């Protein structure tokens, strides 16, 4: 337990607000994503060192399992689900 740094930014679009992630915070070990309880949990991708999107091993936690803990830390996250997408970017990078 110490001082963590969670600096994220997501595209502000009222159309993709449905899958819009509530809040996001990472850690030196793993990263967690908080999503609405009334909404569905989408799949969060990550931009590999190559240039394409890759789906990292995700996990589910929380009192309602509305959280998604990904086993990796990057600077660019691509949340996709159904026919909507929400671009997220981490401006800090602790690890």
């Amino acid at each position: 337990a110490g001082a963590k740094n969670y600096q994220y930014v997501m595209s502000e679009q009222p159309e993709m607000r449905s899958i819009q992630p509530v809040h996001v915070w990472d850690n030196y070990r793993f990263t967690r994503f908080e999503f609405p309880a009334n909404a569905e949990l989408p799949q969060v991708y990550m931009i590999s060192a190559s240039g394409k999107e890759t789906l990292p091993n995700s996990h589910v936690v929380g009192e309602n399992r509305n959280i998604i803990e990904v086993e990796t830390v990057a600077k660019e996250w691509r949340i996709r689900l159904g026919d909507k997408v929400v671009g997220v970017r981490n401006n800090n990078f602790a690890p």
């Binding site: 930014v9 809040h23 997408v85 997220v88």
Partner: peptide, 22 residues
């Protein structure tokens, strides 16, 4: 319709900040 993140107003994902006031 095609979503695509236009980053129109680019809204952060940290507003509440989990710190738990004591």
């Amino acid at each position: 319709p095609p979503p695509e993140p236009d980053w129109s107003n680019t809204v952060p994902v940290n507003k509440t900040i989990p710190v738990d006031t004591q």
